[PDB]
Design an enzyme around this catalytic site. Structure first.
Site, mmCIF file in Angstrom:
data_model
loop_
_atom_site.group_PDB
_atom_site.id
_atom_site.type_symbol
_atom_site.label_atom_id
_atom_site.label_comp_id
_atom_site.label_asym_id
_atom_site.label_seq_id
_atom_site.Cartn_x
_atom_site.Cartn_y
_atom_site.Cartn_z
ATOM 1 C CB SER A 49 -0.943 -0.012 1.188
ATOM 2 O OG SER A 49 -2.040 0.854 0.998
ATOM 3 C CE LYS A 52 -4.410 1.950 -1.485
ATOM 4 N NZ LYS A 52 -3.709 0.657 -1.178
ATOM 5 C CB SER A 298 -5.081 1.529 2.535
ATOM 6 O OG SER A 298 -4.004 1.197 1.676
ATOM 7 C CE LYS A 410 -2.079 3.666 2.291
ATOM 8 N NZ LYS A 410 -2.157 2.426 3.171
#
Ligand SMILES: [Mg+2]
Ligand SMILES: [Mg+2]
EC number: 3.4.16.4
Length: 466
Positions: A49, A52, A298, A410
């Site tokens: 993720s 992202k 996410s 993140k």
């Protein structure tokens, strides 16, 4: 104090949870550029993720913080005396936050514009993006699950988190030995039901499985739900999100007094339509607001839709090939050295993605001084924050540590991949860090990640809230 931290992080990376794993760990003071810590920073690793981060930066660069997304309804001509139209098109241009409510509001606009009867068919137009629903190297067994929803320009987003291309399946126990009640949610009348599930005795084991077998639009429910169990709810993807949007809009029309005589299907506004009559439209919130549920929770569909939107913006091609190049170009244009970046998707779901911890921290530094630094920063999960829309995937990590309320980062996880990358805001200077782990055989190294992030927070002068 510097040699203290370096010794401390070195000791954190000793944890047996990182037995046989590779770890990119880089810490940079964003005010000076000083490299506080760097181990295997140039090593190429799957980001999960954390991909992202690149998508979000690029989308802000390409589309702008003020970018919003449109959806409209078109007939070949306006309704006349009789209030009749022939075929009708619901046209999606990549709004990742389009709700059933928005569909009802547009249905009312259609009604209020004088349409009483759609005499022809209702078509769902998602041609703004290509019809490549899934990234090649994504795993088909993942397909039933919200994070692997098909990608379309026209998709209905469920809930305040705007999970796209899914329906909420509710399974309620009946009497022992009777079939469980399966409510399909939005996809009632759309997806197929294969309910083989039973109500087990009170106190019995919950073995309920909700599947969508590969290549079908069937929700297959198997197993047993205890008579005394709370209802079960699961987000399950559907085939052809646009056609579900079509189905839902059909119902919205009928609900607002618009009779639909024909069928509901996919199709694009025909070329031979000279002056399409827009009977209803809807405009999403701006990207800067969309970035919040995207990055906090996410959202995979959001990322992919944003890559295709980038594709559309840079090249008029609602496409991964075009959008991924658009990400790379926007990142380069931002000063990011993308030498170690392999882009195979926007979400990080794809195992074909590669980053380096150096690249991430490079990006964090570049994003920090960008005009959209704050909207970008605001989208990030804040460590230990209870409010899901604030703490996101970090809501229940680093509570009661120096990191709580301060570290914005993140997360990233899948089998054998874990990542945590973001900022440690310093009453010293704002730190940027990237921790990317590949290979570990057991529990993800979240405590390692937390341990580092907590040490960085302490180093920047922070103390645990008590
Ligand atoms: Mg229905
Ligand atoms: Mg604090």
């Amino acid at each position: 104090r510097l040699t203290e931290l370096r010794e401390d992080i070195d000791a954190i990376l000793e944890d047996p949870a990182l037995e046989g794993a590779v770890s990119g760990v880089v810490v940079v003071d964003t005010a000076t550029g000083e490299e506080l810590y760097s181990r295997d920073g140039g090593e190429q690793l799957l980001p999960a993720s954390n991909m992202k981060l690149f998508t979000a930066a690029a989308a802000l660069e390409v589309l702008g913080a003020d970018h919003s997304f449109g959806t409209e309804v078109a007939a070949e001509s306006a309704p006349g005396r009789r209030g009749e139209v022939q075929d009708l098109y619901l046209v999606g241009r990549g709004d990742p936050t389009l709700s059933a409510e928005d569909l009802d509001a547009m249905a009312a606009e259609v009604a209020a514009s004088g349409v009483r009867t759609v005499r022809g068919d209702l078509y769902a137009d998602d041609t703004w993006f290509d019809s490549e629903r899934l990234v090649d190297d994504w795993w088909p067994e993942d397909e039933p699950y919200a994070y692997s929803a098909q990608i379309s320009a026209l998709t209905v987003a469920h809930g305040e988190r705007f999970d796209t291309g899914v329906t909420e399946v509710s399974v309620t126990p009946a009497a022992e030995g009777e079939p469980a009640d399966v409510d399909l949610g939005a996809a009632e009348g759309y997806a197929e039901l294969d309910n083989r599930a039973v109500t087990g005795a009170a106190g019995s084991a919950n073995t309920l499985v909700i599947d969508r077998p590969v290549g079908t639009n069937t929700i297959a429910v198997t197993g047993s739900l205890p008579a005394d169990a709370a209802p079960v709810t699961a987000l399950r993807t559907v085939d052809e999100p646009a056609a579900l949007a079509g189905h839902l809009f059909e119902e919205a029309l009928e609900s607002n007094g618009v009779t639909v005589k024909g069928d509901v299907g996919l199709g694009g506004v025909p070329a031979d339509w000279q002056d399409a009559e827009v009977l209803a439209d809807h405009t999403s919130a701006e990207l800067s607001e969309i970035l919040v549920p995207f990055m906090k929770f996410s959202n995979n569909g959001h990322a992919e839709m944003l890559v295709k939107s980038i594709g559309q913006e840079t090249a008029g091609a609602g496409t991964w090939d075009a959008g991924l190049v658009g990400v790379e170009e926007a990142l380069s244009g931002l000063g990011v050295d993308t030498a170690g970046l392999v882009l195979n998707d926007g979400s990080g779901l794809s195992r074909g993605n590669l980053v380096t911890a150096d690249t991430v921290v490079d990006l964090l530094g570049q994003a920090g001084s960008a005009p959209w630094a704050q909207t970008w920063s605001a989208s990030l999960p804040v460590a230990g924050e209870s409010d899901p829309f604030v703490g996101g995937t970090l809501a229940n990590r680093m509570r009661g540590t120096a990191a709580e309320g301060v570290v914005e980062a993140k997360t990233g996880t899948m089998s054998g991949v874990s990542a945590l990358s973001g900022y440690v805001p310093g009453p010293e200077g704002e730190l940027a860090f990237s921790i990317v782990n590949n290979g570990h055989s057991g529990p993800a190294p979240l405590a390692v990640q937390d341990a580092i992030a907590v040490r960085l927070a302490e180093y920047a002068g922070h103390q645990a809230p008590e």
